[PDB]
Amino acid sequence: MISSVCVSSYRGRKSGNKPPSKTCLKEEMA
Secondary structure: OOOOOEOOOOOOOOOOOOOOOOOEOOOOOO
């Protein structure tokens, strides 16, 4: 799971996915 725009946004996971507002990836607020 390594996406810089959408990865664990809703892939049955909550790691790379901050609030849908910014980038839903661990790289940003996630």
